[PDB]
Symmetry: none
Subunit: 121 residues, 2 copies
Amino acid sequence: SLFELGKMILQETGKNPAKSYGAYGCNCGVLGRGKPKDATDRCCYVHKCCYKKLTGCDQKKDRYSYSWKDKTIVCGENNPCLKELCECDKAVAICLRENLNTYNKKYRYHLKPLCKKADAC
Amino acid sequence: SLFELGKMILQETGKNPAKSYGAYGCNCGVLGRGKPKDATDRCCYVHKCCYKKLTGCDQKKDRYSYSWKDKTIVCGENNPCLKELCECDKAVAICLRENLNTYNKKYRYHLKPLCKKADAC
């Protein structure tokens, strides 16, 4: 669910997930996909594409189990879709952290930014 | 859409919508419904529940007509869903203004992972 995702993002990046990634570039947020503005943006693109391959489970609503032992995300989840969902979320949280150095506040928005096309996941 | 909603919030509350309500508490902004921290947060909770009843229109992208007449939001749209969407937005805007007195800037960018689970709508 969104709870696990946001928590993962916070754990990996240390940043407020809503503030930094709720509306950033063409892909980080709740407005679908677009041509990535930067590395951070690309993480969210891949993440949304990761969500599409999911079969059955609700990425937004369905909770899953994961461990943060030794400050590492471990999806211990028992369900194929939920295990896959967890790995999607872990991947983006990791990717966002890895690309903190090129994170640019300029790509934050209040309303839909001018985005070129995203290709088919 | 977010444009009309933001304009309504600005008109009712007189506060910059994104800054004041783009990530307030557990319910205002991107992250889905969590247990409301206060009255303001509760408006957003009700708002998100209001959105869930919408049939065939997208609350994020879909434009709609409304007027501001004698400092009153008046929804216009002939389309039933867009009208209903407009009423959701009007209601939260009014609700937010009504609870300005207990607005908490400490919630303005609340860490949503700190939020408790929300009741079903």
